[PDB]
Design an enzyme around this catalytic site. Structure first.
Site, PDB file in Angstrom:
ATOM      1  CG  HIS A   1      -9.161  -2.117  -2.315  1.00 43.50           C
ATOM      2  ND1 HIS A   1      -9.985  -1.693  -2.740  1.00 43.50           N
ATOM      3  CD2 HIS A   1      -8.783  -1.375  -1.256  1.00 43.50           C
ATOM      4  CE1 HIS A   1     -10.315  -0.538  -2.279  1.00 43.50           C
ATOM      5  NE2 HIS A   1      -9.583  -0.243  -1.252  1.00 43.50           N
ATOM      6  CG  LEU A   2      -7.904  -8.949   1.809  1.00 44.96           C
ATOM      7  CD1 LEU A   2      -9.119  -9.200   2.695  1.00 44.96           C
ATOM      8  CD2 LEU A   2      -7.427 -10.317   1.475  1.00 44.96           C
ATOM      9  CG  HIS A   3      -6.878  -2.449   3.093  1.00 44.83           C
ATOM     10  ND1 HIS A   3      -6.209  -1.370   3.057  1.00 44.83           N
ATOM     11  CD2 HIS A   3      -8.028  -2.252   2.751  1.00 44.83           C
ATOM     12  CE1 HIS A   3      -7.034  -0.481   2.557  1.00 44.83           C
ATOM     13  NE2 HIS A   3      -8.217  -0.847   2.333  1.00 44.83           N
TER      14      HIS A   3
ATOM     15  CG  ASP B   1      -1.931   0.922   1.224  1.00 45.19           C
ATOM     16  OD1 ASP B   1      -1.632   2.083   1.402  1.00 45.19           O
ATOM     17  OD2 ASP B   1      -3.306   0.578   0.977  1.00 45.19           O
ATOM     18  CB  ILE B   2       0.767   4.341  -2.196  1.00 49.15           C
ATOM     19  CG1 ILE B   2       1.780   5.439  -2.500  1.00 49.15           C
ATOM     20  CG2 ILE B   2      -0.592   4.777  -1.806  1.00 49.15           C
ATOM     21  CD1 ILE B   2       2.815   5.082  -3.400  1.00 49.15           C
TER      22      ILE B   2
ATOM     23  CG  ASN C   1     -12.405  -0.318   3.922  1.00 45.24           C
ATOM     24  OD1 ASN C   1     -12.436  -0.995   4.916  1.00 45.24           O
ATOM     25  ND2 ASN C   1     -11.254   0.381   3.917  1.00 45.24           N
TER      26      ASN C   1
ATOM     27  N   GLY D   1     -15.318   3.369   4.176  1.00 42.00           N
ATOM     28  CA  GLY D   1     -14.270   3.830   3.924  1.00 42.00           C
ATOM     29  C   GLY D   1     -13.467   3.570   2.430  1.00 42.00           C
ATOM     30  CD  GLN D   2     -15.408   0.329  -2.634  1.00 37.38           C
ATOM     31  OE1 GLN D   2     -16.586   0.131  -2.164  1.00 37.38           O
ATOM     32  NE2 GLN D   2     -14.859  -0.323  -3.633  1.00 37.38           N
ATOM     33  CB  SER D   3     -10.931   6.130  -1.612  1.00 36.29           C
ATOM     34  OG  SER D   3      -9.990   5.052  -1.378  1.00 36.29           O
TER      35      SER D   3
HETATM   36  N1  LIG Z   1      -0.572   3.663  -6.844  1.00 38.26           N
HETATM   37  C1  LIG Z   1      -1.155   3.208  -5.547  1.00 38.26           C
HETATM   38  N2  LIG Z   1      -0.265   1.949  -5.002  1.00 38.26           N
HETATM   39  C2  LIG Z   1      -0.664   1.321  -3.839  1.00 38.26           C
HETATM   40  N3  LIG Z   1      -1.667   1.627  -3.098  1.00 38.26           N
HETATM   41  C3  LIG Z   1      -2.525   2.561  -3.579  1.00 38.26           C
HETATM   42  C4  LIG Z   1      -2.232   3.411  -4.718  1.00 38.26           C
HETATM   43  N4  LIG Z   1      -3.326   4.182  -4.859  1.00 38.26           N
HETATM   44  C5  LIG Z   1      -4.094   4.196  -3.754  1.00 38.26           C
HETATM   45  N5  LIG Z   1      -3.502   3.348  -2.798  1.00 38.26           N
HETATM   46  C6  LIG Z   1      -4.152   2.740  -1.432  1.00 38.26           C
HETATM   47  O1  LIG Z   1      -5.044   2.010  -2.076  1.00 38.26           O
HETATM   48  C7  LIG Z   1      -5.988   1.910  -1.009  1.00 38.26           C
HETATM   49  C8  LIG Z   1      -7.597   2.257  -1.336  1.00 38.26           C
HETATM   50  O2  LIG Z   1      -8.149   1.638  -0.261  1.00 38.26           O
HETATM   51  C9  LIG Z   1      -5.317   3.176   0.076  1.00 38.26           C
HETATM   52  O3  LIG Z   1      -5.348   2.265   1.421  1.00 38.26           O
HETATM   53  C10 LIG Z   1      -4.302   3.673  -0.711  1.00 38.26           C
HETATM   54  O4  LIG Z   1      -3.408   4.401  -0.019  1.00 38.26           O
END
Ligand SMILES: Nc1ncnc2c1ncn2[C@@H]1O[C@H](CO)[C@@H](O)[C@H]1O
Ligand SMILES: Nc1ncnc2c1ncn2[C@@H]1O[C@H](CO)[C@@H](O)[C@H]1O
EC number: 3.9.1.-
Lengths: 114, 114
Positions: A100-102, A31-32, A87, A93-95
């Protein structure tokens, strides 16, 4: 293939990601904006916008994301455990509208989970 | 059948739970210590101690837990979304060694997720 979100671009390799696993069904990458010392995502290559849009026939794929998450957590040394999170929608909190699974670990995770 | 934990007792009906869904694979019931206005668990009837102990052949069952969770969330009116959580081990906050999916909603869920 991969859909029209950030994650579609990652799946098509148009932008790189820190990839830790790939098979024919899914991708895992760091995750970024990590919220724990290890924080990665597991995403299907099939575009499913959100868990509430997954169909019965997607069950095996969804479970594959957790099995991949377990494998990656072990590869990353998460011997003391981890938390998996999906999410859904606004309250979840889905954006990004691609499932996607965290997977979070490397510290004690607290309660409530947000 | 159901294993030797609290959740085994629930599966065998030796103690009741607030059951919201049952099929041949799983059970869903309200959590006794809710962390959100809606907070329920989805558990397999098969005893799998923790996600790190699930096998490849369990993928369909694991995905079934999320599809059941989606259905139950809709039945409970979670129109604005929800969060799904699986805890693994010590760092994940797992206290009962039978796999369980948390589904939380009815409020904004925060970040980080613990
Ligand atoms: N380019 C990217 N690479 C990795 N994680 C990302 C990227 N863009 C958004 N995210 C991660 O995606 C998630 C969306 O739930 C976030 O936790 C966010 O930080
Ligand atoms: N008898 C029970 N019925 C419902 N939820 C329970 C019971 N015992 C423990 N729990 C819930 O199980 C979870 C274990 O992760 C907790 O969120 C806890 O509150």
């Amino acid at each position: 293939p991969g859909g029209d979100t950030i994650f579609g671009k990652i799946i098509r390799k148009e932008i790189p990601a820190k990839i830790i696993f790939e098979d024919d069904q899914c991708l895992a990458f760091h995750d970024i904006s990590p919220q724990a010392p290890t924080h990665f995502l597991v995403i299907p290559k099939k575009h499913i916008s959100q868990i509430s849009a997954a169909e019965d026939a997607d069950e095996s794929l969804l479970g594959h994301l957790m099995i991949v998450g377990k494998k990656c957590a072990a590869d990353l040394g998460l011997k003391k455990g981890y938390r998996m999170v999906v999410n859904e929608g606004s309250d979840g909190g889905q954006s990004v509208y691609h499932v996607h699974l965290h997977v979070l670990g490397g510290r004690q995770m607290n309660w409530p989970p947000g």
